[PDB]
Paper text:
The Rnf complex is the primary respiratory enzyme of several anaerobic prokaryotes that transfers electrons from ferredoxin to NAD+ and pumps ions (Na+ or H+) across a membrane, powering ATP synthesis. The complex comprises six subunits, with three integral membrane subunits RnfA/D/E, two membrane-anchored proteins RnfB and RnfG, and an attached cytoplasmic protein, RnfC. On the cytoplasmic side, the complex comprises RnfC and RnfB that are responsible for the interactions with the soluble electron carriers, whilst the periplasmic side harbours the flavoprotein RnfG. We show that the reduction of the unique membrane-embedded [2Fe2S] cluster electrostatically attracts Na+, and in turn, triggers an inward/outward transition with alternating membrane access driving the Na+ pump and the reduction of NAD+.
We obtained two structural snapshots of the Rnf complex that represent states along the reverse and direct electron transfer directions during catalytic turnover conditions: (1) an NADH-reduced state resolved at 3.3 Å resolution, and (2) a Fd-reduced state at 2.8 Å resolution, with the Fd purified from Clostridium pasteurianum and reduced by catalytic amounts of a CO dehydrogenase obtained from [name]. Since all determined structures have overall the same organisation and cofactor content, we focused our description on the Rnf complex with the bound NADH. The NADH-binding RnfC subunit is the only subunit that is not membrane-bound. RnfC has a globular flavin-binding domain and a small helical C-terminal domain that binds two [4Fe4S] clusters (C1 and C2), with similarities to the FMN site of respiratory Complex I (Nqo1) and HydABC (HydB). In the determined structure, we observed a well-resolved density for a bound NADH molecule, which forms stacking interactions to the non-covalently bound FMN cofactor. In addition, unstructured N- and C-terminal loops of RnfD bind to the cavities within RnfC that stabilise the subunit and could be partially resolved in our cryo-EM data. In RnfC, all cofactors are linearly arranged to the polytopic membrane protein RnfD and located at distances that could enable an efficient electron transfer across the complex. In simulations initiated from the NADH-reduced structure, the RnfA/E dimer samples an extracellular/periplasmic open (outward-facing) conformation.
Author numbering:
A (entry chain G): 1 to 207
B (entry chain C): 1 to 443
C (entry chain A): 1 to 191
D (entry chain E): 1 to 196
E (entry chain B): 1 to 333
F (entry chain D): 1 to 318
Amino acid sequence: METKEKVQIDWKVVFKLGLILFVISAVAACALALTNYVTAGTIEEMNVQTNTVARQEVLPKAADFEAVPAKDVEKIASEIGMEKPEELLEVYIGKSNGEVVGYTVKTGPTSGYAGEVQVLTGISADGVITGITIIKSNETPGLGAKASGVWNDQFTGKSAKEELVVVKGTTKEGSNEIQAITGSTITSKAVTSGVNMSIQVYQNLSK
Amino acid sequence: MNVKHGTFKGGIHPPYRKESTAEVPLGFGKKPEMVIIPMSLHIGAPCTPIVKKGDTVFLGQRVGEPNGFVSVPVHASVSGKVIAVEERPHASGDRVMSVVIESDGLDTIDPSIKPYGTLEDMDADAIKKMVLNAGIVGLGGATFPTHVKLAIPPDKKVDCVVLNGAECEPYLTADHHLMTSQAEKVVMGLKLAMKSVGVEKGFIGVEDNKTDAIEALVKAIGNDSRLEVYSLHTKYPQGAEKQLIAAITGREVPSGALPADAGVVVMNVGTAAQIAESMITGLPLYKRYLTCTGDAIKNPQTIEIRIGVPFQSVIDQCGGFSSEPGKVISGGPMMGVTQFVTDIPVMKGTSGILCLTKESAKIATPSNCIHCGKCVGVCPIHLQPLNIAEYSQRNMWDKCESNNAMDCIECGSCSYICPAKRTLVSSIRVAKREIIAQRRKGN
Amino acid sequence: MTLIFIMISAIFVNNFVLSRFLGICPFLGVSKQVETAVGMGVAVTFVMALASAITYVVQYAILDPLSLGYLQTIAFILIIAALVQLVEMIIKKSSPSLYQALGVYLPLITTNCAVLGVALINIQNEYNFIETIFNGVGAALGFTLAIVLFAGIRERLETSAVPKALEGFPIALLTAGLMAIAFLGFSGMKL
Amino acid sequence: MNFMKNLTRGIIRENPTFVLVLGMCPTLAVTTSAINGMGMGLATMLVLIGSNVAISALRKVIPDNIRIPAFVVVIASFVTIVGMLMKAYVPALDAALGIFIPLIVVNCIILARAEAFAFSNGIADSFADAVGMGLGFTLALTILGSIREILGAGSIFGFSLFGAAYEPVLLMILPPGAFLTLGLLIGLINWKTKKA
Amino acid sequence: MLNAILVPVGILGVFGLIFGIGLAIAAKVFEVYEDPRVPLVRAALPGANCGGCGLPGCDALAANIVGGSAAIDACPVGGASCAAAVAEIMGMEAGSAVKKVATVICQGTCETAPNRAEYYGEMDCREAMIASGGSKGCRYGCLGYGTCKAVCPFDAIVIGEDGLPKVDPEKCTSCGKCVEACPKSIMTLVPEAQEVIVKCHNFDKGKIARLSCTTACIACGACVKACRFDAITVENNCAKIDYDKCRQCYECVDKCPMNCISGDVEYGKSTAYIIEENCIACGLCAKNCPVNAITGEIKKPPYVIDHDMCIGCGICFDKCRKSAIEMRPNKTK
Amino acid sequence: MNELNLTVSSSPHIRAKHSTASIMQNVIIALLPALAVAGYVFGLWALALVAICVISSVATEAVIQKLLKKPITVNDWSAVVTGVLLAFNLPINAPWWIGVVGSVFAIAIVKQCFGGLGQNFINPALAARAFLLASWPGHMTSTAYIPLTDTVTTATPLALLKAGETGSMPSTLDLFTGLNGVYGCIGEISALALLIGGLYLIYKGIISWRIPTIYLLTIAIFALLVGQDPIVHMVSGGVMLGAFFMATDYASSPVTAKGQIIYAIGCGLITMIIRLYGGYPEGCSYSILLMNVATPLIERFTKERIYGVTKIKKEAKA
Ligand SMILES: NC(=O)c1ccc[n+]([C@@H]2O[C@H](COP(=O)([O-])OP(=O)(O)OC[C@H]3O[C@@H](n4cnc5c(N)ncnc54)[C@H](O)[C@@H]3O)[C@@H](O)[C@H]2O)c1
Ligand SMILES: Cc1cc2nc3c(=O)[nH]c(=O)nc-3n(C[C@H](O)[C@H](O)[C@H](O)COP(=O)(O)O)c2cc1C
Ligand SMILES: Cc1cc2nc3c(=O)[nH]c(=O)nc-3n(C[C@H](O)[C@H](O)[C@H](O)CO)c2cc1C
Ligand code: SF4
Ligand code: SF4
Ligand code: SF4
Ligand code: SF4
Ligand code: SF4
Ligand code: SF4
Ligand code: SF4
Ligand code: SF4
Ligand code: SF4
Ligand code: SF4
Ligand code: FES
């Protein structure tokens, strides 16, 4: 019965297998906890610094950025007319010499081709988009990775009163017209969508 | 008469050139001077000769006794003096034990030969004994002994006898002339075989292109309702055993089995005609209707020839070579065996002497398979030769056995229809031989 | 409809072997025959389903309240590998038959990228429990379908006269590349 | 004599990408450029060294029944250490890699060489084998990434080659391009070996 | 601060303990019941996976063996060393298996044995065997289409310029694949030390064989009369040399009418070359020595013996109780 | 004796008249009217592109087959057929190097690397289109650009159907003959010429009616079930050439009747699914390639019952 009671005194193999695995796992967990205590704060500090320099690149006219409360971040997201927003991450207000100089919004995209892409949009106080920057994009290289670079220059200096539209062509026929990247049209319609939520947020904030 | 039509699934339609010899009336041959009688005239064990140098024999004299159950005696075709007993060339390409003999000149018959009687005097055991004594084998090509087929085992039940009068091969019109001229002998042989087996149903398989043979058979049958004649669609390999049995009776012979399992006994028309002739006269099998044809023959025709006459003598009887032959074939184009020299005596089972010239013997070199799927569409056994051939060429005998390479009948349709001019039936024969050799070695 | 969409996306649109670069070493190693491919597919299916269930029930109940997202991979390994060991034990004695030690590829089910990758994706995508099981089963069925089709193609190529330099693994890689080219047509489907 | 023999065997004669046919998911998934291939090769080399040293040092305490959990637990701990260190130091490489950094544990090369050579050999021999095999994997990844980047981006290590009007072969960096390139490279290697 | 270290250690330890307990309680139930006879024999076999010994693969012998259905030397690829290793694992003596090489027993070129009908079809020996039993003038001769070369896995057979295959003695492991795969049943296995071989597989009589090939065995019977040790026999009108009783006296090759036996005249001639140290002038050699090529007076050392001619023999390692006679190949070339 | 030098073989000693060269010559003869209509609608550049593809394919096959010491088999006319069918897939604005690269990829990797003629497993002309479309979408997206007025086309009729803009579609009869305001690939302007070629191929016995008939039938049935116009769906796009000349490929289609029926049904279903719900304006290439991948499974599962075996019930090996 039960293989001669696990060969009488040979229950020790059943005991020692578990004990050895327990000791090895405990040692590995102790090492992992120690290294987590060593390098936990550096990761978040580097992430904050990267976000800060990215925000500085987008809006050079702002001396410093002030963070709006997250309750407001949900508040404007609730009523200005998107079905399931779930993407208005953060809104910052630029500040310089006693006057508000612009806004920066990390919204987007809606629905990308291979997931979601986070686009940072900076709009000046007088109603001019000063530039956009992509900070997270899990797209295929060669097609979706081309959206960060010269193409972003298409979004600079444009007015901030009407929504943008993406067109398939090599001719600029409209002020609110954006030329799509050749070979990648789904991504080019998602970044402009993030710009559309950004200008909607700016229009609500200007009121 | 209720003439019924039957056919099967698959096959080809080769260009039957039955015009140069079919309309030419059948002639005879001159009295031969010398004959080579081999000891291997059948698929069974070879016989042992008893005549030595300097002896004198007559027609029908015994020359070699059988050795085993599946073996048949061999009789001398023409009376004369034996001059040598030695190894001589054979239709299979090898050299076999044989007796060469020059003839006397007057064709004296054996006094011991007597008629066996009539149909009502002859019972089944005596019919089997007469078939064994007369030296009658399968004239359809296989040269299998007839007395083995007529001796059915007690554990197998048979209900009908089928005559195979369907020459599916091109260039061969021997059976056409046989049923055109000797229909009564065919009917008598069918009746004798049916009485020997102990059945009551008889069928005859004749292709529809020979309407004169159909009319002659219908006239010869008379008012006997126990025998029927079937007009089959002109096709190849319709003359085969399994295909004829599936067309006439509708039954299918099981894989790896015999027609005795299907309840049928099938014989060639020529075998029945020879059985009737031996019953009437008592003489053994020493003559055969042999057709000589091809584009290298001046006057192709069908003639009655003895057994033991070399190919050169009969070829010279048919006017000789018009040009230089490139292939000499002993049989049909799709089943014949190619030859090395023309000093080979005619067999009991040789069906035709075919001579192909150099222009008609040129076949293009085999090329890559294009996977057209035409070999599978013409198989009467529903195999896929494009797999069996590729497995045989790569030395994979297990997959050849798994792909049913032993169910092939070697009809040659797959290699005929192939656009790439490949050799599919030779690789399948290689696989068959290797599987049989492995089975022999393992036991 | 949503579960059917998840299964379709896991099997056809986002097949793990042919569209996500997960689980290729056993896809190339044991796909020489159809029967071994089917056995591998069944074993991987059972392992993937059990792994998806256990890592889902451990991720949202144990690790998340305690804020231990850094140990996650290690924990998942202790869920996967041990089970695979039991699977390696099942294939020999429990059922008295089926008698196949795959060879340097049965211990690699723990090392299979399609087993841990589906578990990681299934929390990266924030799916529910029934959705977790359905997506795991769909990924397993996609792996089985891909390996069965590849085994069939290789058994067909067994008769082709491939060159001696390309016999073996290079022809398998070329066949996998052509299969991926064929499967590229499902990209961008929004059902 | 065995140290250099094992190192040379790991570098040239084994070459897990080209001959052993292992570790193929990070081989075909991240070799779109030479820098990513170099980073994967270095990380795999470091993890393989650590895991092989630890396993060969702990060969006398691991029984034959729970070998897989202990082996992959040690490998996973080392992989987590390496991944956190490169998260702290090299964020660009980790961002380019993504999902395959936690998936270093499921590299078939690491556990295959743990269960094949590191379990029944000494510390020095296992260390030499790990060094040689990591160098071979790094060289294979670098060669494949360089070829793929040359054909599908017109650059090596970020420096453009075919001017600026070159239109890239966009399937080169796609999965079929990697599969076809690896098949052709292994075929060329086999032909050169057989004809020599 | 302490609890941040106790929490993961405790969690992973609990998981490891319960998983190890489960695996250990399942392992004892899931018992394979294997014997230590398969794991210790895997490096003794070469692992070539070459089927000429029996069961497929080289991993099939370490699933067998505990039944006695195969001998110790069943694997010829491993040879004497592998056979001795298997025998010492099983605990019995290992036989002295002489190494063997595949050899053709037909020496016929396209010039010596011309064809009589050109052949159309696939270039293979079995395919030519189907087409009316080969196209060669000699029925039993070598076709030369290269089936034995395509079957041999060690690449030890090279088809020569004359059509016959040549087997490299260094690369042949005597696996026996080419012997079974030759349709003409020509390939055989010969010991490496044996040089005098009858190289004609012809079963025909005198005149036919002489007409077919210029180096054909005609069963004249001179080789049997020349042989003294009774090692060569004429069966089926063909000569065959029994390699066990052949002492290589090189006398059958001399008296063959048309050089049908593979050998050269360079042999023996050592009329009892005797080391001076280990003989006591016994005088047991000059008595008869049938051809009388030793005669002397008691022969005190050193031996005064004239060497003019001999028989070869090669058997005088048993007539000496002290083994003073030494055999050395000393002739022309 | 006289030296009668005969020939030796096993069986049969008579063969059929047809061969591979005749089959491919008849395929090209059937393809010729589509080339004529392509030359009429577009101009001399279509013929120039066809010649470029043919020359590239022939040269690539000859060079690769010579470098491998194999006998040169450019006389079976398979390379010319592959080059013509690949040049029929290209737009009029495709540069010459696209055609050369496609021909090199079709002959070298797809065909010659697997063994040669009839020894591959996938469609070469569709593999060379599924590679140029994914590598250079900018050139493979803008198919055909010049009407007589040079600016009244914008898009092509198949994309307008997916976009819902049916107000500028041809009136379902000009799109059939292919005369005015229709623009696709080189050989897809006219469906009547492809229908004539397919009928000629069916008459000659080279292809079987099963795959084209069932393909068109299931496309019509699906388009009628959803609610679209079936005639517009069969006529427009590369349905005709794909069904007649590419789904009926020899080395990548099942050899049995049930296999061909299931292959055609699957091809039609996947084509309609990809067209209606996928990201591409057409899905003939990807559906055909997918059914070429799954062809060995259908071949394995649809074997004909061999004469004699009466369905042994899986109990002879237990
Ligand atoms: N010249 C001609 O008219 C001609 C025409 C076509 C074919 N042939 C050749 O004839 C040869 C015949 O081949 P096959 O495939 O028909 O059959 P087969 O050669 O296998 O044997 C023929 C007869 O023997 C049976 N048989 C064998 N052993 C038996 C037994 N113990 N009991 C009962 N029956 C037994 C067969 O079914 C049949 O009755 C073929 O090789 C063929 O190609 C000649
Ligand atoms: C491919 C093939 C074709 C055959 N064609 C014929 C034929 O046309 N006529 C014929 O009598 N036998 C033909 N046979 C032989 C038959 O199968 C059968 O064995 C023979 O007719 C029996 O002869 P028997 O009546 O003398 O017993 C053919 C065999 C094969 C394999
Ligand atoms: C009916 C028919 C259709 C063919 N269709 C194609 C095809 O799309 N593309 C192709 O390249 N070759 C085609 N070929 C040529 C064909 O290459 C060759 O048989 C093998 O496909 C090689 O892959 C065809 C040949 C025939 C007879
Ligand atoms: S495989 Fe056999 S049965 Fe089928 S066609 Fe060829 S020879 Fe006839
Ligand atoms: S008929 Fe010939 S070319 Fe066609 S599939 Fe069969 S073997 Fe291949
Ligand atoms: S012959 Fe020797 S090496 Fe070859 S498979 Fe047999 S045992 Fe193994
Ligand atoms: S020559 Fe013959 S016995 Fe020697 S290795 Fe080759 S196949 Fe084996
Ligand atoms: S020895 Fe035998 S197998 Fe080798 S070439 Fe000669 S006949 Fe063929
Ligand atoms: S006669 Fe002897 S040596 Fe000459 S070919 Fe025949 S077997 Fe060879
Ligand atoms: S001497 Fe030569 S020819 Fe005479 S029997 Fe001996 S081997 Fe044959
Ligand atoms: S070498 Fe001497 S012993 Fe050997 S067979 Fe010839 S004569 Fe006889
Ligand atoms: S020991 Fe030898 S050498 Fe000396 S006498 Fe005796 S036989 Fe002669
Ligand atoms: S072996 Fe004997 S018989 Fe022969 S030479 Fe020597 S001593 Fe004389
Ligand atoms: S399956 Fe081998 S590394 Fe992913």
